[PDB]
Write a protein that binds this ligand. Sequence first.
Ligand code: HEM
Ligand code: HEM
Ligand code: HEM
Ligand code: HEM
Ligand code: HEM
Ligand SMILES: O=N[O-]
Ligand SMILES: O=N[O-]
Ligand SMILES: O=N[O-]
Ligand SMILES: O=N[O-]
Ligand SMILES: O=N[O-]
Ligand SMILES: [Ca+2]
Ligand SMILES: [Ca+2]
Ligand SMILES: [Ca+2]
Ligand SMILES: [Ca+2]
Ligand SMILES: [Ca+2]
Lengths: 241, 241, 241, 241, 241
Amino acid sequence: KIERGTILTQPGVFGVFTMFKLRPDWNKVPVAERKGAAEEVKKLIEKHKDNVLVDLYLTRGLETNSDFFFRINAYDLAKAQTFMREFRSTTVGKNADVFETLVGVTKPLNYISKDKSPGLNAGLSSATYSGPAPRYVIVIPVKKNAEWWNMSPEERLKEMEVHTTPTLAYLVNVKRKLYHSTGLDDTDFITYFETDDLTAFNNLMLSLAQVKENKFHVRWGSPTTLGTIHSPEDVIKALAD
Amino acid sequence: KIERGTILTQPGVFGVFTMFKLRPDWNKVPVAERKGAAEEVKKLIEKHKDNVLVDLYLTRGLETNSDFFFRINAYDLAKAQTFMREFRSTTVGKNADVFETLVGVTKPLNYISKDKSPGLNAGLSSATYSGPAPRYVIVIPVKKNAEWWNMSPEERLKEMEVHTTPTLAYLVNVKRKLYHSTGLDDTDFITYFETDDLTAFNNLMLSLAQVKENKFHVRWGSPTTLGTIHSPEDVIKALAD
Amino acid sequence: KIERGTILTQPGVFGVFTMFKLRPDWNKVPVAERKGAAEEVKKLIEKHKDNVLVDLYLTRGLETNSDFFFRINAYDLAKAQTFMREFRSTTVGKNADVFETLVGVTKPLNYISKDKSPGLNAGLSSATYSGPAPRYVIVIPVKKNAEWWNMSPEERLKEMEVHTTPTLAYLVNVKRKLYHSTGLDDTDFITYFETDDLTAFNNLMLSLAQVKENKFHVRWGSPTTLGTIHSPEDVIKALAD
Amino acid sequence: KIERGTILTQPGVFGVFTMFKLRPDWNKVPVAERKGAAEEVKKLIEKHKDNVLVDLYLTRGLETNSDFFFRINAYDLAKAQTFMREFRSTTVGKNADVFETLVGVTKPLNYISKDKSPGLNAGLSSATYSGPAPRYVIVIPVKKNAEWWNMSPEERLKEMEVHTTPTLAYLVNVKRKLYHSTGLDDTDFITYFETDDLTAFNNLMLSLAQVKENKFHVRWGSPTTLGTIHSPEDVIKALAD
Amino acid sequence: KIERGTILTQPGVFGVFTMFKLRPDWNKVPVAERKGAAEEVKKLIEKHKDNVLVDLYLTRGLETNSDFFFRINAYDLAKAQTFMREFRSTTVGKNADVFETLVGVTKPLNYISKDKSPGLNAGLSSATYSGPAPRYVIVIPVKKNAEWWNMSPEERLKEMEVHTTPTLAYLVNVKRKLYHSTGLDDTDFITYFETDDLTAFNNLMLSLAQVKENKFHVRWGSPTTLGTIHSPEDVIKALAD
Ligand code: HEM
Ligand code: HEM
Ligand code: HEM
Ligand code: HEM
Ligand code: HEM
Ligand SMILES: O=N[O-]
Ligand SMILES: O=N[O-]
Ligand SMILES: O=N[O-]
Ligand SMILES: O=N[O-]
Ligand SMILES: O=N[O-]
Ligand SMILES: [Ca+2]
Ligand SMILES: [Ca+2]
Ligand SMILES: [Ca+2]
Ligand SMILES: [Ca+2]
Ligand SMILES: [Ca+2]
């Protein structure tokens, strides 16, 4: 068992994000096989119901380098691998190349904890999304330089309390998840957002752009991937025609 | 309901720039199929009359990584997506690859407003383009560094008052629009120009290269895209033979 | 009416260089349709007698990302577009991809002009190429940084006077034309050289690598394109077997 | 003769890491020939029993730019070349492109030797991996700037003494191997790791991110390759379906 | 008349290195035509006995972006071009893509001459390559920043005296050639080496990395190409099976 509620909430969980882009020779796959494609993916996800949690998102028309992308959660990285491997054997899998992959792992809080920063940590854990279900997904890999990592845990804590201050407000607006990747893939972190209000999301990024921590970023995007939230079959249903 | 003159004037409007490149195997779609590509597009635009505003520019012969590009404006990014997704299902859509996409959103004035900078804002608002209808479009994404963003509002406004001083004069020549992207795509801004005088346009950028604000650009083109303005069908008619 | 001696001499003249690479399936065009491809380019050039000036250079064998490139000069960028657009409809045109395009425009002298720098300006106009018909062309795109442009025109003039002092002597040896690109493409300038002496030309760059101006280059080649000068019909003829 | 236990333990051994990516026309190799592909690699590996040591890793589903990768060890680079060259003629070989290659060579200890740092060396040599056979491999190419190389051996020793201090403890968890590359390929080192505990691997990197040495990396990944450990024929069997 | 001993030794000699990578559809050229492709290259090289000097190296299995590469020496770049151009029409030629090209020219000594640095000129010119016919080739493009070029000749001399010192001991071990490129291509230098001791070569490069001059490299590799020495026909025979 892998309950969506729990797995998204616990440490030690692997995320594997994989951006795929359909090849042109998918248009020539017979309108028939293509329309059977969504069901095949749906079935695959059920098969791996107990090994990994699957999310699928539609970026076609909004992104140069992906038509759609998966988020995979697993307690076992090898299991994430197995699912993705089987996905690429599927009809759609066979007609799309991979354009990006980010591997990450969930960890406990490093800075804004009950021990280290009790005040902000309360604001954090007792904050709650309000309003329309989010339609938009944003995924943003982040890497910081040696200079940041060479700061004292005390100095980086103060920087991260600065990060947390103007941003708590946006938790009514925007959902967030943080994955950790240093040494696992070419990025320090993989950040995941769901929102309905992009203008708000824009203001949120500017907020964080304007603080000292931004000064240490060497990757903060590239790609910034913003696509649209749907059920797995519905994403494949949209790629069909 | 979407009137051209309204949506290009209002805040909260999503811009979706998408630069397309036709594959070779388009010169092998028969002349006849190719020539009816233009009506297909024309009919897609009328179909989305009320969802999006569509602009289409010829870049073939002027740009390495596009033959053409769209500008879509929308009150709903999701509707920009759908239109784009449906354009890529079009005869022309099926024989072209995407090579760049820029997402952005219109905002109110940040710096040169009636409150913050009355003198220049007057100058800006009360100035109107003169002479021959623009033949050329230019689209330039811009990203400023963490250092720019960590300067105070007062420091940043001074720098934008500098940007605006030498440029106001060029509004008799050049038309402009400013989209905002931080956190939504890999760029801070997407700028849009229409002019008939490219020599002017050159003198305009040099005016800007020459000031302090240019010191914080980490992206200021790449790609700088200059193409030629036509009606949507006229762009596809041109791409056909 | 467009006369080579006049258009290459006047300000406000648009330059469009475009580097093409032949696709593997060009060897599969029956040889002779290939050889008669040259007549087709010849006819296109005469057809546009009145619209653009055309040059064609062979780079196959000397460059990674081109077999050949055009130089177009026009009074109307639009007409250069049409020309190129019509070349890509050509038989050769249908078997080559574009790998680079540089757009620029001719301007009056900025620094080394009769008023500003009387002595060098005289040396410049009254200097005259000797020795053999140049065999080689070099095209170098150049971009300078915000720091250069943020120097006052006095400081930059001094620097351009420094550029011009060791270089006048190379005018017997080497032929130059300077196009201007800021805001029109992803470079500050396009530089164009014809020489027969490649050792001399290397000595020329090093002279210029060793002055303060070089400190401000963020692009100075990339690609440095050195190819071989011929008539248009001869370059296609060469590309044929 | 080449024995695993020895060649992995000695200086002067050439490492050749090659990352391959299967092309889409491999799913069109007949299920028959594809299933026969594994035994063919298995026999190729036996045929070179006495020439090179072969490792083969599975990255499909965890990596954009590879599906599988080899680690060859040889006393003779030529021989590692011949094996690879012969692998590429294999059924799988003829269906994959190379996306990365790293050539390195083993050397005696430069810093934490018995002579120079006896304290840490005792800890490094008498430390022993515990618990589960490693399911994951990580390969990281690392290159340090001119600044690092221009520090004195005393200063660089101090910094490697700093590298070793937090890391020795991960030797119960993580297996390491260091190859050297300056002058031979585009990196200063190739590091190789095997571990079962990716969370522990992440913390190990963060340990090292946080010390002064990290300040001199110009390459530390790019790519970071993390795949999954199996027998040569199993990797291929997994690529087949 | 071109003798290998003279042309490799004289100033004013053009070097053209060209890295090819074989396209997958070469494996589908009839085995027969592939075996015949070697004699073809051999006859073409005879054909240009007197136009160029040709060397050809095997990189398949050791390099991502080449299977083979040519070194052409000519007294006339245009003849190098014809040669390469005729090679690309050859059977193998028609099945490979160009992945790198470097054009360079041989010059007299700039620093460690008899006039300017007598002592070291002696060292250099007196010790001679001993040791086994070299199995390995290395080719490294090198480009130095504007800071370097702006140092006085006296300062750069002092730097190159420090380069030369540690290298003197590898005179028995490693063969070198230096071409100059500034202004002719996108590098300052192309360096060429033949050796049988890769460990030694690694130690030589580390010695050079550790001197001040390494501080001014902006390109010193990328690619670093290391491959294997054979007769041209043997190289193409190597690519056949
Ligand atoms: C607006 C709502 C947000 C809140 C309440 C928030 C809160 C936090 C907190 C409390 C931490 C520290 C957690 C820990 O170390 O255990 C953190 C870390 C982080 N956040 Fe956010 N954040 C928000 C939005 C964002 C955005 C828009 C980004 C940009 C992608 C972002 C990027 C990051 C990154 C990269 C880290 C890890 C920094 C490090 O490695 O030390 N967050 N965030
Ligand atoms: C001559 C015509 C131009 C005029 C009158 C003009 C005016 C302005 C004004 C008044 C602003 C401030 C808007 C605000 O904060 O609300 C602005 C912002 C901006 N402009 Fe222009 N501009 C012109 C040409 C250009 C050009 C050629 C570029 C180059 C792409 C450019 C790029 C930008 C960017 C990137 C911003 C936003 C800066 C920021 O985020 O703080 N503008 N412009
Ligand atoms: C040896 C023959 C050369 C001569 C006589 C020469 C002369 C000049 C002169 C007089 C100017 C100023 C023109 C003006 O501002 O209106 C100029 C500008 C320039 N030259 Fe050359 N030059 C020569 C070679 C080169 C070479 C080898 C390069 C390298 C690409 C080069 C690159 C440039 C660039 C980029 C500019 C414009 C600088 C700016 O934008 O302010 N020139 N040259
Ligand atoms: C936790 C287990 C590790 C231990 C016990 C360890 C230990 C060492 C030691 C003792 C040396 C000096 C060897 C010598 O000079 O002869 C060394 C060098 C090196 N290590 Fe590690 N290391 C570990 C993990 C890592 C990791 C995670 C990396 C990151 C890729 C790494 C990268 C390197 C590199 C690039 C060098 C060469 C430094 C140089 O060129 O001077 N090591 N390591
Ligand atoms: C190991 C045997 C080597 C010897 C005996 C040697 C010797 C020299 C000498 C004497 C010069 C000055 C030539 C002149 O100014 O005319 C020179 C220049 C140069 N060497 Fe080597 N070198 C060796 C190895 C290397 C290596 C491994 C590299 C790196 C690939 C290298 C790269 C260069 C470069 C880029 C220059 C040009 C310096 C400049 O442009 O000012 N050399 N070398
Ligand atoms: O720190 N929000 O991923
Ligand atoms: O600031 N003109 O987009
Ligand atoms: O300044 N010669 O382009
Ligand atoms: O020092 N571990 O490669
Ligand atoms: O400095 N030897 O190319
Ligand atoms: Ca990776
Ligand atoms: Ca994006
Ligand atoms: Ca452009
Ligand atoms: Ca290499
Ligand atoms: Ca070149």
